[PDB]
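yo

u said u wanted the structure for the complex thing, so here. seqs first:
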Amino acid sequence: NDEREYLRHFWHPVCTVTELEKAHPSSLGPLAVKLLNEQLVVAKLGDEYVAMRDRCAHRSAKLSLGTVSGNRLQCPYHGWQYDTHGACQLVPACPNSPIPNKAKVDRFDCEERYGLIWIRLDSSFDCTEIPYFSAANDPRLRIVIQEPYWWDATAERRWENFTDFSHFAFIHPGTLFDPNNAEPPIVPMDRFNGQFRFVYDTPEDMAVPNQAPIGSFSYTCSMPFAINLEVSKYSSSSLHVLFNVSCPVDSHTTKNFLIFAREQSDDSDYLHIAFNDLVFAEDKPVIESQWPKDAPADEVSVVADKVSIQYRKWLRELKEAHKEGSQAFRSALLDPVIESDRSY
Amino acid sequence: NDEREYLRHFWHPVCTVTELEKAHPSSLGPLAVKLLNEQLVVAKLGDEYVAMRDRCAHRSAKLSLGTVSGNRLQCPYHGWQYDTHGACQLVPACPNSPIPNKAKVDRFDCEERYGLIWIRLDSSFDCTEIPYFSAANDPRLRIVIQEPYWWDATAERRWENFTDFSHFAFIHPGTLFDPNNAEPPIVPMDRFNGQFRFVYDTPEDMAVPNQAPIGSFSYTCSMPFAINLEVSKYSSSSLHVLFNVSCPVDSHTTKNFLIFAREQSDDSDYLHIAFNDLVFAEDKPVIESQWPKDAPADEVSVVADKVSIQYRKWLRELKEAHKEGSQAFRSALLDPVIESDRSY
Amino acid sequence: NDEREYLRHFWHPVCTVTELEKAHPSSLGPLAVKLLNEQLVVAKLGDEYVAMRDRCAHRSAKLSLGTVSGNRLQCPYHGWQYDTHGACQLVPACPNSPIPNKAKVDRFDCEERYGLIWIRLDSSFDCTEIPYFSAANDPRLRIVIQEPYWWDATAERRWENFTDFSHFAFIHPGTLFDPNNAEPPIVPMDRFNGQFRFVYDTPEDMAVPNQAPIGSFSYTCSMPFAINLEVSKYSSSSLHVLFNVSCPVDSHTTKNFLIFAREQSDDSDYLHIAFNDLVFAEDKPVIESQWPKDAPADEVSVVADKVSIQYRKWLRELKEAHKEGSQAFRSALLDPVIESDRSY
Amino acid sequence: NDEREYLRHFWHPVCTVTELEKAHPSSLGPLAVKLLNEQLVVAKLGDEYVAMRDRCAHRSAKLSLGTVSGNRLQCPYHGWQYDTHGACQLVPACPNSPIPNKAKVDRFDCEERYGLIWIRLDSSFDCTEIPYFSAANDPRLRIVIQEPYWWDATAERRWENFTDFSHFAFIHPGTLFDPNNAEPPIVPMDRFNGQFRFVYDTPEDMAVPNQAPIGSFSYTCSMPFAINLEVSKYSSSSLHVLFNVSCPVDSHTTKNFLIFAREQSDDSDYLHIAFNDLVFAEDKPVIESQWPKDAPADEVSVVADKVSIQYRKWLRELKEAHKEGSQAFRSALLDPVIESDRSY
Amino acid sequence: NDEREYLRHFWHPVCTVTELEKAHPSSLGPLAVKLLNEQLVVAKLGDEYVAMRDRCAHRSAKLSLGTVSGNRLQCPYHGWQYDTHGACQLVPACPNSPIPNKAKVDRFDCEERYGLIWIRLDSSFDCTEIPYFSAANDPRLRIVIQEPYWWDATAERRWENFTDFSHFAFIHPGTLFDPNNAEPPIVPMDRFNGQFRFVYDTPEDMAVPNQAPIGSFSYTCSMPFAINLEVSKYSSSSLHVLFNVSCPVDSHTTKNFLIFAREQSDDSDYLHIAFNDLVFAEDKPVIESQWPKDAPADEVSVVADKVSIQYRKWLRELKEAHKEGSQAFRSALLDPVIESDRSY
Ligand SMILES: Cn1c(=O)c2[nH]cnc2n(C)c1=O
Ligand SMILES: Cn1c(=O)c2[nH]cnc2n(C)c1=O
Ligand SMILES: Cn1c(=O)c2[nH]cnc2n(C)c1=O
Ligand SMILES: Cn1c(=O)c2[nH]cnc2n(C)c1=O
Ligand SMILES: Cn1c(=O)c2[nH]cnc2n(C)c1=O
Ligand code: FES
Ligand code: FES
Ligand code: FES
Ligand code: FES
Ligand code: FES
Ligand SMILES: [Co+2]
Ligand SMILES: [Co+2]
Ligand SMILES: [Co+2]
Ligand SMILES: [Co+2]
Ligand SMILES: [Co+2]
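structre next:
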């Protein structure tokens, strides 16, 4: 848990709002989720999304097997009722007696945004924010939230797969790139407000389907695991946005979320969903094969790996700064480092 | 067989638009569907939804395994291309030769309405229309189209299940009615424009969930299988509309569609979907147990069965009038028969 | 397993007699069983039930894959024949050679009582007895031995679930308690002859099925894992006895046994079996959810938890006394500690 | 772990040539295989069978999901191509740049012999050879390579099962021996050229099928896991050879190979395959039951266990000599030790 | 059964010799097979392959559940023994009494050829022969018998699929033909000795794999269901032969056999097997979709359908001639009808 501890300071998606509403017939939850190997429960208490450890203080039953009752989450075993702060406010067996001081469960940051539920396990450094999705509140764009997809691969390896262009000719030859353009350009990369920003111009006139988001690629990557990709498409001259983020469920699993938005929206959502699913099915077996799950020091990079080289370097900086404490981590995350000629 | 020929003259839903778009990665279809034991294929050819028999004129392959190409449907076997009228316009093996006169497949009236695809197999009487859904184009109402649900029961038995309230205390005691209000009123029923119209007032103060659409019930039933139920709810003083229609797939199977609309729409869609699904799960085993599948003459009615009795009577009249021809059928369907004091 | 070693000194049930007879077509076993993570084999050799380690001394094959031949258990691999004392008496490959003195397997106390097979792994303290079942040899009572039921929960958590008053309202609302009677009395508890003894008069006039054993509850709990509950039922004024005992199979699993006896026995055994199975089905998901599997020090008790508080206290004293040896253990188990006004 | 390092110095079979050719539609591989817990990939690169670690040096994808291209193995992820020495010779993303010095993967000695693929993980002692199969290149004999069979048992326990006849009466009574000849002779055993050699004469006139290879048995066992058994059958006066060898896949699993050759070969191959499969099915549950998987020091031998005893002794000597280095190991393996009157 | 009766006069394959030898551990059978909806049993009695109705004369048990005992097939129920002529020669219950005259089962023509077992149900016209396989006894060629493949399609539709070239561009675009050459040539077709003979020159320089049998195509089709295709390949300048034959199992199923032979045989059998299997997997869903299973009179042909038009015409002639009797059928089958300029 040691090398991963710094990840607890970020906001991570754990489920869609849809999944929470479908979990229990009340539409309020509770829903069991797992984040960085922590077993948590999510529920809607009044107007608030809450996240607690999925473990009752009394006899350790799972609260995720319980029931929302107005402004309370009720344990299924002996009916202890927890408020939005994780504090027990009713012990039905002793309704007069004072409630023990220890009758509380851990309560974590939990917020809805973009149709996903986000949890931050450690808020002590008070310097991380929910990742940036550029299409939110853009009335020009129709937004579709896909169903989550689970991979037997880590969030770091998934991020590197999503931002890697040298693999398109070998993994996506029918679908995203010609098999003949295996040589990608080396682009400037900027750190700004805790995001990696970089821009690409993919090759034109490739034998790829019209629904393929191929064009001018503008990445805004909220560290550590979210990618916002704005595509000015060549084929249609219209904006298409991909927002992909991985939930690090445990040491070898990710629950992954894709939200996409498009300016030309008279067509079928399922044209795009089927295409995204095909791309993911092409990536999945190769990424799941990578072993060990966490990239060892012995991996051999080439110059075309600039994006993942720079990604790994920043992650190591954040892990090092975490050991040094709050101010060092804030600096490592939010200090600007500009390579390009743009102004922010 | 013979008993069911008259049903070919009505419009029946065969799939949702969502089902069509999901069937094939192109989002255009084709999709195989079955209606009154006919194997059909639906596809979006240009701006039109087209229904054809699912059987190529060349060597009888299923066109539903083929592909939409431009505004035509291409057979998977030797690539014959069919236009919106079912006529073959390209024989790839014989590009110069004249296309055989009989190179064509049967085409059927096919329209989208309310997010469903409707097919009329026999248009020769030309007096039937797509059923009425009251909530379409009412901006006060949020509309949800559920996924279809399949039952091993006929469309007639499904219709009678949907409009019966005698069964609420026994099939839906927790969910729609109190167990001790089993006695229902007997209301006037009007025939108008091929619809059964009748109005109820279900019992008040019943211990049923708040998401239960219980209140004053106004039915508009487009013969033979569609029900439009407008509820002015007691618990929320808000309009809730249920539109239920059965596809008669064959002699013992229905593919059933529910669309629901609601005025108070700040809550979760899945609160309502979960409730509807629970109601359907309560009905399903009992309706599927009814045998023989078609109601025989030996069933014993009581006065509380008025809706069922009058429905069976009208269906019998429609079946007999169909044998007398187009004009007799038009009168049996569209002549008014008013029982209530309502103006028309 | 250092902290479970004291449990080896008690008698634990490992199967029903029916299970042993059904295991092999001979009706004599062998049957593989597991107790405290020890792999054992049970068989009927002549008139005796025998238990040995399930591991042949020769080449370590499982004797449970072998065959009973009258008064011998024969290994499946090279046919070594073990007698009722675990000693090899025939090496078929060397019929004239003397049998090595090492050719023996560990043999454990094994006795039938009440239709179960009991094993005691360590008889050195010579102060433990098979648990008490009050209905044995009471000719007024019809006895039913249920099939065993397996839970992913420990024997301690199962015992505490069975004797807990406060969960009935939340886990068993339809079946054992009204949801309104959540506040239990705090009763005197006596230690006598290695049993916990306590009485509880459950609430009257509860909307609960008539086959529910609800009434005046008299518990005789043979430590560590057996519960004998005599119910003088309110609804029928007749005696109903529940005898529940958990086999600690390993650190996270129990094989549980229920025997029940009843004075009014003209009804169906399966009326009561189905009721017991419904109660167990209501408990099972919540008990299996408790984590960690062993109750840790951080659990928060309230005054209504008296029974489980006192149970945990006695188990801890037995564990500590086992470290101090035979006499200290005998005193911790068998010394009386009287809280009530009763005489024994 | 440490206990098994000496086994890396021997040649072990990992697949049949048939398995390699079936793995990929090209018939060239690649095929993933596992040997002593190492994940390897085998492919036919030009005229050579090559074994590499199944892990690309770039980003650790499995080369076994890749493709043979010319005389190289191409990774599925970014198309790096590895030559027969494990060196990367093409980085498609950086065609002009120099290939990193560390762009290479470990390669292992790999040869085809007898229709199997053999791998030696550690070649530094350079004193081991591929096991001896007597029937290779004997045109009097028809050879059949069976499909591999997997057992949840170690290669040591499998070897001892194959060379034991004490068990025939109990495991194979219908098939290999009479049940009442359980007493076997004790024969001289010779060590010569890294092989155990010993000769038997099984009992005559036994009620076993004609396809049973029962007769005069001559064993040549190439240490540690290969057995060559030449049978001069009693029933047919014809030579029958069984070659059995176990791949030690990991600490508890074997992938086992049987090749059999016969002089009288006008009958069906499947008469013999069915018989061998029946024998293996009789052994399998008993051998898989042996626990712990590795034989501990507490097993009790009898004089009939001579073959097993001498096998364990030699393995112990090889393990100890390996710790002393290459010369000590060569002597322990290849020094002769003659017990019989046979000339060498 | 009426329109299919003429097919009983031909020899049909029912299993491979391998399948017969694998069916029972004796390697002699019996094996149940089904041909033209007849339930038959195949067994090897001495040197003879025999086929009988799979139904004992005594109490109608299946002989396929029985045992070969030298020159007899023994029923499993009461052990009646049938000789190679289907006559019972032993009634174990009455070993002295005369055997009833009716104690016989129907016996059918049954012969091995090319590694397949062939059955002819009706030999009364004495004019049909086992189909021609050109590669048999050609020492230049290596022969591989594939495992049978089952399709939900009739033998007529399978034959037409195999000899159809207009479908390659749509069903086999990667594998057998360019998608751009959809236009096939019209070739002369000869009837000779009950075979259709015709020759094709497929297009050259197509983007197809090297193991694809593409070249000069010489067909010899033994009516009604066997195709012998000799390919003088363009890519390798070497002979490749495909022998495909369908067993008409019942009215909607075929059990299909592929044997292939090749002159250049230093490569892997599985290169070719995998390619054939890919081709079959491409055909299978489209052919299984064709409905009704038997081609109706309403199918619309084009000039490129010459082969199947001529096939259907000959089949109709054979069906008509069958009604007229033995001499008419012999003439329809064996009279020559020459279109080309070759001499036979
Ligand atoms: C990584 N990735 C994707 O996963 C994807 N899915 C659909 N377009 C996509 N694009 C353009 C992309 O770059
Ligand atoms: C038949 N029926 C239903 O199936 C249903 N489902 C949800 N409300 C429902 N109501 C009010 C109803 O009358
Ligand atoms: C724990 N428990 C049970 O498990 C049970 N099962 C049936 N009656 C029961 N009673 C009264 C009970 O207390
Ligand atoms: C161990 N073993 C076998 O596994 C076997 N299988 C077939 N004959 C066999 N024989 C003679 C044999 O000794
Ligand atoms: C029909 N057919 C096949 O099924 C086939 N399979 C492999 N080559 C093939 N060829 C050349 C072919 O014509
Ligand atoms: S375990 Fe939650 S209330 Fe007791
Ligand atoms: S079957 Fe449709 S094109 Fe031939
Ligand atoms: S392992 Fe039991 S007799 Fe050998
Ligand atoms: S992981 Fe193999 S080429 Fe990149
Ligand atoms: S049924 Fe065959 S012998 Fe009696
Ligand atoms: Co990718
Ligand atoms: Co209902
Ligand atoms: Co309970
Ligand atoms: Co054996
Ligand atoms: Co084909």
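Residues E 56, 58-59, 61, 75, 77-80 surround FE2/S2 (inorganic) cluster (ligand 10) (CB under 6 Å). Chain B touches chain A at residues 18, 21-22, 25-27, 267-271, 274-275, 278 (CB under 8 Å).
cya
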